[PDB]
């Protein structure tokens, strides 16, 4: 038997400890206090946990993946800080608290977000141990590719421009979600598998894996935005009900969306058959959690 809650509890606890030690208060105090206010706010830490689980799945150990794991959690956090800003979605609640910009100003929020992204690169580059330079450089590259214009950003920009299309096909809605949500989960899993010593074939299998849960994660985020209250999610929920955003609970409905999340899950887990069920148990649990979470 595999206790997924005890697993997630100690891994989240370990990641939150490294995040807190990685981003310390120092001059300029406001920039740093604002970086810490959102980073240590209280997310589920799905991305760094995926990074670490993939690392440990191919033979590596947590300590080598930790810097990279914090890095994806840093970029994830800054992508949310910017996403909540008045020119983007203008939300007022995030991770259970007022959004960053409401507490420090749009300026500091923007800056703090930029510092997180920058520092994520510094941290992985300069703090990762138990891997040779070539591995590190390579990982930094995958990280770059997963969040830039062929990754996260592209997804978010095509999302704010495609906020008018009322004839969006399942290929335009596919592109959105794969880039704005799957690309970072792909980078998280890949980063850990490479830093774990993994072989090209394994890495390729896992990338294919992250792909399925990455799209699953989003599909589920859209359902939560239409079925749960802002208090419950800890963030501003509902604004996807009005705004002409490209979502699944629209182009096919909520029930058919659920069904879809279900297929996606099964597909992800069917990728994990590549590995022994004993070593795949953690990523199998993370895949379910991603599917049935309530936030």
């Amino acid at each position: 038997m595999f206790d997924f809650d005890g697993y997630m509890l100690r891994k989240a606890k370990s990641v939150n400890k490294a995040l807190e030690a990685a981003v310390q208060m120092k001059e300029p105090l406001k920039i740093h206090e604002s970086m810490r206010y959102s980073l240590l706010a209280g997310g589920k830490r799905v991305r760094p946990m995926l990074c670490i689980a993939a690392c440990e799945l191919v033979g590596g150990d947590e300590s080598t993946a930790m810097p990279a794991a914090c890095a994806v959690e840093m970029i994830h956090t800054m992508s949310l800080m910017h996403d909540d800003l008045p020119c983007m979605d203008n939300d007022d609640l995030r991770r259970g608290k007022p959004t960053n910009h409401m507490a420090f100003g749009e300026s500091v929020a923007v800056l703090a977000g930029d510092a997180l992204l920058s520092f994520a690169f510094e941290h992985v580059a300069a703090a990762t141990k138990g891997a040779p330079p070539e591995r590190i450089v390579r990982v930094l590259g995958e990280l770059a590719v997963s969040i830039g214009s062929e990754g996260l950003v592209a997804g978010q920009v095509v999302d704010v421009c495609s906020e008018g299309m009322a004839e969006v096909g399942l290929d335009h809605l596919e592109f959105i979600h794969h880039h704005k949500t799957a690309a970072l989960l792909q980078g998280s899993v890949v980063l850990g598998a490479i830093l774990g010593g993994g072989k090209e074939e394994e890495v390729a299998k896992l990338r294919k894996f992250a792909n399925c849960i990455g799209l699953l994660f989003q599909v589920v985020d859209d359902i939560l935005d239409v079925t749960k209250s802002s208090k419950e999610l800890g963030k501003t929920a509902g604004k996807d009900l009005v705004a002409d955003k490209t979502t699944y609970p629209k182009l096919i409905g909520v029930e058919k969306s659920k069904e879809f999340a279900d297929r996606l899950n099964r597909e992800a887990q069917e990728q994990l058959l590549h590995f022994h069920p004993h070593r795949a148990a953690p990523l199998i649990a993370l895949a379910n959690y991603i599917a049935y979470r309530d936030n």
Binding site: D114, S118, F119, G141, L143, I147, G148, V153
Partner: protein, 242 residues
Amino acid sequence: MQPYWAAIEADIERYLKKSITIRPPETVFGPMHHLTFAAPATAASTLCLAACELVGGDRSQAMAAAAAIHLVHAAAYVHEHLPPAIQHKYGPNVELLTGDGIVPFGFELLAGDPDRILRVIIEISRAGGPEGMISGLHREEEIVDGNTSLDFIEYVCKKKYGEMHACGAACGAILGGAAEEEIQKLRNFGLYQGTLRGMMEMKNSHQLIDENIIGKLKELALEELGGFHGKNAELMSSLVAE
């Protein structure tokens, strides 16, 4: 300016164009391309190629780094101008997101020998981070046109431009394979030259910047260049002199 620097600045433009080509989806690559060249030319970028050429290496080894330094600068520039203080070609959200995508592209170019690239990523990332250029952007929001001293303004310039220039010079010396004692000298040269450039441009605002501040940064820069010789050493000196 000077043709030697305009020539090097242009090789960098050719490489950025070579690397960032508009393609589908264009709603992504248009702003990326447009905003990269909408940012002014930074000498932090050409110093890299120069410092590298000054220590025996060829600029083709420092190009990727020079490009990254520029893009890091582009992103910061885009961000320091969200509102419509004027009429931008793209909305505040596309600009905001494009900056977020510019920086990673600079790291992507570098990641794409590995002990020096690692060291350079650390340099650029630290220079564009909370303790570099962002400290300058942040503190700048405080400068009141005629109520702020030259000491405070020189500081913001050191953080906003100085650190990126110091970093450019350093990455160039590192990529050309120079020795630690040389990297530091060049890093300090950049630091002062950059702080200087920041003062020139900050001069346009309130004209109270006496030639004394300018001569100090100038003098401090060339002193660091002592120990170097040849054609390239005087070319490097014309970045502050002339």
